[PDB]
Amino acid sequence: GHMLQNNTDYPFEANNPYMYHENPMEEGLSMLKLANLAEAALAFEAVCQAAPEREEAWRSLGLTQAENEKDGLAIIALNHARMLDPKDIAVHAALAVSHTNEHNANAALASLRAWLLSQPQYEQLFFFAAPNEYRECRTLLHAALEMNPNDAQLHASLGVLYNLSNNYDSAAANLRRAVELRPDDAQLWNKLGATLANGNRPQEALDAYNRALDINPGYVRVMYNMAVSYSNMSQYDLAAKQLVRAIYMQVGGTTSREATRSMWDFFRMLLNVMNRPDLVELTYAQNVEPFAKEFGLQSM
């Protein structure tokens, strides 16, 4: 028997043309290979609306959403996948990352813990918000690294752990190691960039983001993160240009905002600081075109 309603906690997009298609899962996967995340997410939403028992659909949706700068929706989707397959280690890794971003410390540590101990190769094994949980995660990961040295994902996972406690120096070293081992992994470069940025190294962060974008040119979270690093260095032309790219790509260019509404408000702050009150007035309407044109990304 089919089940249609283990999905009522997810705010599905209303007018989803993928609901009319024959194989939206296949199409979502194709859109991912194209790096069209907003579009990928809509196709996976269709699958989760029709077949909410398909774990792979929730996993793909979750992964796509966090890449499209929507951690809250990522966590909702991923929790479904986690219920339908508690050994899907990609779901646990992703939950750790999105919870770290959301500053859910207990959930992040629990996700790193499940990530490790769900793998048969490792199952034998003052941070104020969750002190002994953090120490146990550190210990597990270090024990794992002595059984499997030079593992990129253990080093990445230590990176996430150390981001949680603001030990950006140790996080950077570990993620640096992980990208040396896997230099075509866009997420790893992004993770290293965010770590450097959060540790007051934006110039180095931007080098990592460029590598991430050269790998995955539709990686909207990297685009956002570049806006952030540029803004942190007061380079507002560069910030503005990347932020406009991010907004456009996040919504899927030609196509329920919220994630978008704070990016627009952030963009307003940039336009204000650069002394452009005409441009500021335009942000209220939340149309990309004026800014795409003003900032050299499109036409005229």
């Binding site: 965010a194 979270r221 952030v228």
Partner: peptide
Amino acid sequence: NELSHL
């Protein structure tokens, strides 16, 4: 400064 995301 503003926060970056993993």
